[PDB]
Design a protein around this ligand. Structure first.
Ligand SMILES: *[C@@H]1O[C@H](CO)[C@@H](O[C@@H]2O[C@H](CO)[C@@H](O[C@H]3O[C@H](CO)[C@@H](O)[C@H](O[C@@]4(O)[C@H](O)[C@@H](O)O[C@H](CO)[C@H]4O)[C@@H]3O)[C@H](O)[C@H]2NC(C)=O)[C@H](O)[C@H]1NC(C)=O
Ligand SMILES: Nc1ncnc2c1ncn2[C@@H]1O[C@H](COP(=O)(O)OP(=O)(O)CP(=O)(O)O)[C@@H](O)[C@H]1O
Ligand SMILES: *[C@@H]1O[C@H](CO)[C@@H](O[C@@H]2O[C@H](CO)[C@@H](O)[C@H](O)[C@H]2NC(C)=O)[C@H](O)[C@H]1NC(C)=O
Ligand SMILES: *[C@@H]1O[C@H](CO)[C@@H](O[C@@H]2O[C@H](CO)[C@@H](O)[C@H](O)[C@H]2NC(C)=O)[C@H](O)[C@H]1NC(C)=O
Ligand SMILES: *[C@@H]1O[C@H](CO)[C@@H](O[C@@H]2O[C@H](CO)[C@@H](O)[C@H](O)[C@H]2NC(C)=O)[C@H](O)[C@H]1NC(C)=O
Ligand SMILES: CC(C)CCC[C@@H](C)[C@H]1CC[C@H]2[C@@H]3CC=C4C[C@@H](O)CC[C@]4(C)[C@H]3CC[C@]12C
Ligand SMILES: CC(C)CCC[C@@H](C)[C@H]1CC[C@H]2[C@@H]3CC=C4C[C@@H](O)CC[C@]4(C)[C@H]3CC[C@]12C
Ligand SMILES: CC(C)CCC[C@@H](C)[C@H]1CC[C@H]2[C@@H]3CC=C4C[C@@H](O)CC[C@]4(C)[C@H]3CC[C@]12C
Ligand SMILES: CC(C)CCC[C@@H](C)[C@H]1CC[C@H]2[C@@H]3CC=C4C[C@@H](O)CC[C@]4(C)[C@H]3CC[C@]12C
Ligand SMILES: CC(C)CCC[C@@H](C)[C@H]1CC[C@H]2[C@@H]3CC=C4C[C@@H](O)CC[C@]4(C)[C@H]3CC[C@]12C
Ligand SMILES: *[C@@H]1O[C@H](CO)[C@@H](O)[C@H](O)[C@H]1NC(C)=O
Ligand SMILES: OC[C@H]1O[C@H](O)[C@@H](O)[C@@H](O)[C@@H]1O
Ligand SMILES: [Mg+2]
Lengths: 364, 910
């Protein structure tokens, strides 16, 4: 015959629950959400107020610096400690020029000494913070050959006119060679030579050491492979010439597999402010005291009125110091509670029968 | 690409599904608003891209930013063409607001709704084995906005099972009977119907027994059967032989001979007994006439090439048929000319309409009083619900008959539209005939039609009846069913009789004055230009229950003139009843087109028969009843059902469900696209709109396909407003589908505004979690990449959109919820699968890095809350404080009012 097959799914009789937002089961839901979110917001603010950080900008360590021990202007340094809220303790900073190099735009060395009135447990991250450096433009972020990153010795035929991801304006130089780390990304590396230790000043016997091994996800070591070039068809990018004045030879080829500083720079920042990890410490707690940091000044900043600096922190389980998560949980909980009270009042004042059959539009 | 190629397979798979589901044209109403909404969405895209291009180019002439040192962008162009290329790249990234899948998703959902209609057990007529097959798949939501149901008395309201009950012969009413129509009329009068009905039934049984005994004692017939003797007049069996003289006897003999001879029925032997016959014909009334003539004594059998074999009280003779003119709907009469011996004369006998035969009646050889007696007898028959049939005879000499035959075989034998000359010849030969009486045939309604009409009228539908039998029988049938209830007065617009003397003029002025008067005292509504503007704008609702009755001439004059047309339109906007009688099929099509085109509304045109196909074709939702042999009304229709008692389910359950489902789908489909493209734009306010894409290149082609495209389809297909039982119990809900109170541009605009706000919340939570130090990775390694921010934003947007779809769904089944959880699972698992592959070079660790970060979940939960909080709060302070009828009904049947009736229930079932 032609009778349709009867079934719980074919006859639109699937097992289901029909919910109606009756006040018998709306106020409990709002109270549950409000209580849970206030609890979580309070917990996150309690855990997050404990984090401490030190931000020290040093873009003015060349022009506006003295050869003597000055004090950082109150417009650069920012110390945030959860145990000393009245702790200004302006840090000192000195400039040591270097007339050997002809790069007059920015050169020398910056000696920044600060004081930590507490200690950071078993994990200290030193990041370089940049500001007003546009690293998310369309042409900038899409220009880096993937074949060279993967280690293949791709030629100009497949590095200049590849798909949408290709190093267009910095593919080859005037001598017919192709840059090894081609692209506007690798050509714009952060050249500030950060040190390998925070030299102490009150006790020189125990310097606080940092290692630049493991400052990137280990996973990228399965993607950044050693190159396969013969140092005869490649040249450093135009902005890298000061690092390899004689060009690429048999031994100066940079092995990007373990070059974590460069791996962290091949992920362009999403927004204008940039914070990329450059030094890590995972073994020894940093005891409270005065510490010194010596930083190179190869990378020019003031030409585009940008900013650069260091950001030292222990971090937390939700990143660095950021009240936003706790504030917005508190706002959500407060709004839910306020809405619960509003419904309670408007239900006790404009009350009505729940299954009011005499309120339908056709029964009036 | 991948946003346009995988749609080509689906758009042909959805048609292969229709083809498979058919071996076993015109658009809907929501499509126009859909096109308008798509246009407005393109307008929003254009304004966004215009702003993006305006900003991108302002900063190229600004202070020395950091793009002229590390990017080598030293080219002599900043706004002549760089703004142009910025706008072009902006639009090619923003193509997300170009809805291509909308015209595929809506097709899939309409096809699924039509299939669910086709596979409903309650839409199955077991007796005939005919499930409700939707001939057209696009029209499935048009059933939820029906305001006029143009019924048809031919075979929809009444089954075409004719039963002879009475007949008038020379002023004598041979026939006594008692059916449900008589009981209904008596109940309308007020007298008792139970005891009186039983007494009349037993008297009728006694009369039938006496009749059959007298017939058996009279003579013998080879086809007599005591089961088909529905005629219960013992006053004719006595008159047959001699018992009341010869003037009445010969007239009765001629009457029965006319019944037995004038026919178009084919004769075949019975399968079991070759002596028994199984005469079959396309016209049930002709079959009933032939059967009663045969069983009263004048048997008809066989079919010769010239003449018809007939048995008269025993003698088996062979007539001589000369010509026969068939019966057409526009002609309303069927005739035949035969030879009568003594130069033998020609006898022409015709049967036709009550009014047509009276118009086609001679004024020379008549009794001058038999006309009035026959007219009063026919009116009495029709008042109790008997569709009459007039018989007219004529005697001719061979000269005039031969001249008529010459005209007939010179004109009706020709080509190039022969039917006009055929009609001319027929009207020439049918201008002088004498009435010899009429008959009475009744047919009962279908099963549950009174309750079906009660449900249809209770749900605000203003149903019409384009009958053709006659005025009185139509009024009686409307009273027997629920089209004409009590406490209602009938404005008759009949342009003759008693309403002609008061306004004595041509029918033009008669109908003008009568319609204008009735419209004046019944309402303050006089006018024909601006009152139509209120009528169009107010969207319709019955009030002040009245009824209107229109004749064939009244209809043909009330829609011919412009002022007549609008006056008729304004008058017939009354509550629930417009009985148009004696109407031709052209008049049916004209009135349907009038109601549809002017004051654009929704017109269901249920019917059955080859004459009302013009009504079905020239309508919006043409439901075709599968009844008698005339299945031409089903093939050229929009739907097909076993019998009328199914429309009350096809309009009150599937129509309302489909309309609500699509009206809930469309705004959410624009919502899910806005909440993503505006997120791209909000990322675009940073980096000065240069053209970077926040998400991956593989979220363009998987956000509108797999992440959040399945839950919307399931919402629009498998959502039940209320279970069908309550929809039957409370048809008044369907009212919201009539006033257009569910799909209006305000709802869509508000949904788009909610999409914009939720895009703001969706994008600006990850940024606010990133703006201070941008090291939120619980170990400082740093995500920092626009693809991982895109993962944050996409996760928030997908979860919020799925939960938004799940909130506005009326029925939480185990299917839609399962697919919402599965869509979230698809997003997470596919991010994991694609990220752990060399083909995701830049991304390469989305799952391992982003998803393990407690910051990601800490921001996802709050994004989900803050996205749904405004809508949920507004719904709670609107479904408790300004509740619509649907919320009250849902609260009622959750309390347990409608907890007694089972799931498979419908009042339209005896
Ligand atoms: C670390 O990274 C920074 C920035 O990424 C480096 O600073 C960049 O230094 C290069 C040169 O070392 C400099 O490039 C241009 O410098 C001069 C600007 O006018 C220009 O004269 C210079 O031109 C030559 O090198 C060219 O071959 C040619 O112009 O001929 C002249 C001789 O006539 C020759 O001197 C060159 O075009 C970049 O401008 C500068 N970056 C910025 C933003 O200004 C820094 O050197 C890097 N240091 C290390 C140690 O890696
Ligand atoms: N075989 C036949 N020969 C002549 N007249 C017939 C007939 N069958 C029916 N009639 C009557 O003649 C009239 C011709 O109209 P027709 O039947 O074509 O459409 P209609 O709408 O007026 C009646 P219906 O709704 O039953 O089809 C009808 O009113 C009908 O009562
Ligand atoms: C801690 O670091 C300081 C700074 O580099 C070291 O002091 C220098 O040590 C070198 C080698 O012994 C000397 O040549 C310099 O003259 C020292 N400079 C100063 C200012 O004292 C110190 O030796 C380190 N301590 C340890 C234990 O390694
Ligand atoms: C913290 O301790 C680890 C564990 O020894 C050190 O990691 C080793 O570093 C040396 C470099 O001197 C390497 O030769 C070893 O191969 C490393 N081993 C492992 C298992 O990583 C790390 O250098 C220490 N860091 C600091 C700042 O003291
Ligand atoms: C390859 O080029 C590099 C360039 O840095 C050379 O390294 C310099 O040369 C001296 C050799 O006298 C190295 O010991 C030093 O590492 C570099 N000089 C200074 C001052 O640091 C390297 O020698 C070159 N190798 C070959 C084989 O030519
Ligand atoms: C640097 C940090 C401390 C800045 C924090 C600013 C916070 C504490 C301030 C600034 C803007 C303020 C909000 C402004 C508007 C409203 C809307 C109101 O209906 C609820 C309170 C609420 C939501 C305020 C809550 C507190 C608020 C969020
Ligand atoms: C949905 C859209 C049309 C609503 C209006 C968008 C407005 C509010 C948004 C979109 C573009 C945005 C602008 C984009 C560019 C800049 C330049 C910057 O130096 C100051 C902020 C400013 C001026 C933004 C202000 C806010 C802005 C104008
Ligand atoms: C049935 C339909 C029309 C209900 C409409 C719900 C939506 C469209 C309405 C109800 C709640 C409204 C939101 C309520 C709260 C906010 C935050 C406020 O700072 C700006 C307005 C804004 C963003 C409103 C936008 C529109 C909104 C989301
Ligand atoms: C209809 C839409 C525009 C309503 C928007 C909701 C408003 C009230 C909310 C949602 C997004 C929020 C903004 C998100 C981003 C920023 C930039 C930050 O540095 C200061 C807070 C500020 C400025 C927030 C202020 C409040 C804000 C604008
Ligand atoms: C390397 C990855 C793929 C391992 C699998 C990650 C998932 C399955 C595991 C690992 C970390 C876990 C999360 C750790 C922290 C929280 C925050 C808390 O408020 C809700 C539970 C939640 C969100 C856990 C859910 C499950 C979780 C996300
Ligand atoms: C150095 O900075 C201080 C404060 O930031 C300012 O007062 C002073 O004028 C600056 N000097 C120069 C030479 O820029
Ligand atoms: O010398 C100023 C300027 O000159 C040229 O435009 C290029 O070599 C630039 O890289 C350089 O900065
Ligand atoms: Mg019919």
């Amino acid at each position: 015959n032609r009778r349709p097959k009867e079934d719980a799914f074919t006859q639109q009789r699937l097992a289901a629950i029909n919910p109606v937002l009756t006040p018998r089961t709306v106020l409990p839901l709002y109270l549950l959400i409000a209580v849970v979110f206030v609890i979580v917001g309070g917990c996150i603010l309690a855990q997050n107020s404990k984090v401490d950080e030190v931000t020290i900008y040093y873009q003015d360590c060349m022009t506006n610096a003295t050869s003597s021990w000055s004090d950082i202007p109150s417009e650069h340094w920012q110390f945030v400690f959860h145990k000393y809220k009245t702790y200004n303790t302006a840090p000192q900073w000195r400039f040591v020029d270097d007339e050997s190099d002809d790069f007059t735009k920015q050169r020398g060395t910056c000696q920044i000494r600060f004081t930590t009135p507490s200690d950071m447990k078993n994990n200290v991250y030193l990041n370089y913070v940049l500001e007003k450096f546009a690293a998310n433009h369309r042409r900038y972020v899409l220009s880096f050959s993937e074949d060279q990153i993967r280690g293949e010795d791709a030629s100009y035929e497949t590095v200049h006119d590849a798909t949408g991801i290709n190093c267009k304006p910095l593919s080859k130089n005037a001598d017919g060679k192709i840059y090894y780390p081609c692209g506007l990304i690798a050509n714009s590396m952060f050249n500030d030579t950060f040190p390998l230790q925070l030299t102490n000043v009150g006790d020189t016997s125990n310097n606080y050491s940092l290692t630049n091994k493991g400052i990137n996800w280990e996973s990228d070591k399965k993607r950044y492979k050693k190159t396969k070039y013969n140092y005869t068809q490649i040249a450093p990018p135009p902005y890298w010439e000061k690092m390899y004045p004689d060009g690429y030879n048999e031994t100066n080829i940079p092995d990007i597999q373990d070059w974590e500083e460069f791996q962290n720079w091949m992920r362009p920042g999403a927004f204008d402010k940039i914070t990329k990890l450059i030094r890590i410490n995972k073994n020894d707690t940093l005891p409270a005291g005065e510490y010194q940091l010596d930083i190179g000044l190869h990378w020019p900043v003031l030409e585009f009125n940008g900013k650069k600096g260091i950001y030292l922190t222990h971090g937390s389980h939700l990143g660095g110091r950021n009240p936003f998560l706790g504030i917005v949980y508190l706002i959500g909980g407060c709004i839910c509670a306020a809405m619960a009270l509003i419904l309670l009042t408007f239900w006790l004042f404009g009350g009505r029968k729940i299954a009011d059959a005499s309120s339908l539009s056709w029964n009036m | 690409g991948f946003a346009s190629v995988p749609l080509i397979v689906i758009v042909i798979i959805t048609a292969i599904k229709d083809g498979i589901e058919d071996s076993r044209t015109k658009k809907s109403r929501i499509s126009r608003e859909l096109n308008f909404s798509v246009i407005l969405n393109f307008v929003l895209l254009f304004i966004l891209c215009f702003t993006a291009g305006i900003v991108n180019g302002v900063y190229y002439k600004q202070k020395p930013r950091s793009r002229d040192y590390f990017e080598f962008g030293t080219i002599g162009g900043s706004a002549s063409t760089n703004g142009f290329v910025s706008f072009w790249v902006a639009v090619i990234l923003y193509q997300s607001l170009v809805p291509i899948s909308l015209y595929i998703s809506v097709e899939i959902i309409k096809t699924a709704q039509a299939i669910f209609i086709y596979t409903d057990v309650l839409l199955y007529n077991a007796k005939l084995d005919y499930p409700c097959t939707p001939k057209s798949w696009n029209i499935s939501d048009d059933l939820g906005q029906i305001e006029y149901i143009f019924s048809d008395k031919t075979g929809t309201l009444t089954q075409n099972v004719m039963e002879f009950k009475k007949c008038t012969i020379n002023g004598v009413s041979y026939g006594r009977a008692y059916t449900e129509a008589l009981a209904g009329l008596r109940k309308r009068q007020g007298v008792d119907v139970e005891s009186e009905g039983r007494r009349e039934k037993e008297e009728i049984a006694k009369d039938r027994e006496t009749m059959i005994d007298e017939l058996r004692s009279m003579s013998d017939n080879t086809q007599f059967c005591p089961e088909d003797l529905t005629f219960v007049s013992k006053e004719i069996v006595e008159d047959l032989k001699g018992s009341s003289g010869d003037h009445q006897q010969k007239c009765c003999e001629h009457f029965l001979l006319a019944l037995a001879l004038c026919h178009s029925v084919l004769v075949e032997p019975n399968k079991d007994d070759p002596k028994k016959l199984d005469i079959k014909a396309q016209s049930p009334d002709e079959s009933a006439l032939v059967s009663t003539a045969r069983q009263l004594g004048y048997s008809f059998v066989g079919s010769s090439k010239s003449g018809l074999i007939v048995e008269i009280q025993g003698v088996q003779k062979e007539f001589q048929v000369l010509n026969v003119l068939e019966f057409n709907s526009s002609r309303k009469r069927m005739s035949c000319i035969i030879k009568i011996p003594g130069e033998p004369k020609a006898l022409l006998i015709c049967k036709g309409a009550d009014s047509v035969i009276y118009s086609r009646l001679d004024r020379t050889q008549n009794d001058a009083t038999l006309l009035e007696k026959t007219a009063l007898h026919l009116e009495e028959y029709a008042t109790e619900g008997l569709r009459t049939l007039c018989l007219a005879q004529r005697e001719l000499t061979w000269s005039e008959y031969e001249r008529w035959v010459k005209t007939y075989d010179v004109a009706a034998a020709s080509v190039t539209n022969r039917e006009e000359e055929l009609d001319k010849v027929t009207d020439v030969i049918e201008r002088e005939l004498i009435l010899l009486g009429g008959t009475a045939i009744e047919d009962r309604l279908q099963d549950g039609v009174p309750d079906s009409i009660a449900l249809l009228a209770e749900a605000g539908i203003k149903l019409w009846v384009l009958t053709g039998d006659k005025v009185e029988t139509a009024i009686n049938i409307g009273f027997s069913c629920n089209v004409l209830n009590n406490d209602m007065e009938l404005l008759v617009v009949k342009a003759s009789g008693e309403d002609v003397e008061e306004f004595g003029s041509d029918p033009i002025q008669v109908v003008n004055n009568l319609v204008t008067k009735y419209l004046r005292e019944k309402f303050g509504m006089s006018g024909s230009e601006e009152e139509l503007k209120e009528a169009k704008r107010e969207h319709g609702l019955p009030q002040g229950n009245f009824a209107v009755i229109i004749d064939g001439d009244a209809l043909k004059v009330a829609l011919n003139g412009e002022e007549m047309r609008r006056k008729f339109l304004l008058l017939c906007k009354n509550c629930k009843a417009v009985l148009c009688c004696r109407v031709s099929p052209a008049q049916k099509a004209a009135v349907v087109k009038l109601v549809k085109k002017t004051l654009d509304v929704m017109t269901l045109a249920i019917g059955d028969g080859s004459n009302d196909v013009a009504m079905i074709q020239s309508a919006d939702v043409g439901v075709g009843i599968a009844g008698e042999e005339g299945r031409q009304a089903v093939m050229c229709s929009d739907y097909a059902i076993g019998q009328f008692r199914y429309v009350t389910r096809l309009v009150l359950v599937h129509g309302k469900w489909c309309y609500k489902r699509l009206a809930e789908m469309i705004p959410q489909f624009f919502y899910k696209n806005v909440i993503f493209t505006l997120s791209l734009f909000w990322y675009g306010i940073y980096n000065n709109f240069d053209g970077s894409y926040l998400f991956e290149y593989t979220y363009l082609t998987f956000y509108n396909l797999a992440f959040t495209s399945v839950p919307v389809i399931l919402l629009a297909v498998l959502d039940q407003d209320v279970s069908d039982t309550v929809s039957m119990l409370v048809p008044q809900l369907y009212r919201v589908g009539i006033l257009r109170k569910e799909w209006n541009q305000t709802k869509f605009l508000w949904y788009m505004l909610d999409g914009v706000y939720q895009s703001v919340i969706c994008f600006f939570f990850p940024y606010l979690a990133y703006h201070k130090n941008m090291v939120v990775t619980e170990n400082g390694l740093g995500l920092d990449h626009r693809y991982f921010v895109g993962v944050f934003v996409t996760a928030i947007a997908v979860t919020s959109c799925n939960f938004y779809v799940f909130m506005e769904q009326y029925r939480w089944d185990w299917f839609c919820g399962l697919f919402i959880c599965l869509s979230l699972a698809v997003f997470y698992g596919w991010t994991g699968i694609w990220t752990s592959s060399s083909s995701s070079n830049e991304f390469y660790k989305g799952a391992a890095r982003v998803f393990a970060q407690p910051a990601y979940w800490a921001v996802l939960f709050v994004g989900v809350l803050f996205c749904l909080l405004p809508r949920f709060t507004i719904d709670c302070i609107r479904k408790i404080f300004y509740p619509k009828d649907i919320e009250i009904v849902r609260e009622m049947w959750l309390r347990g009012d409608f907890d007694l009736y089972p799931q498979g229930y419908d009042p339209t079932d005896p």
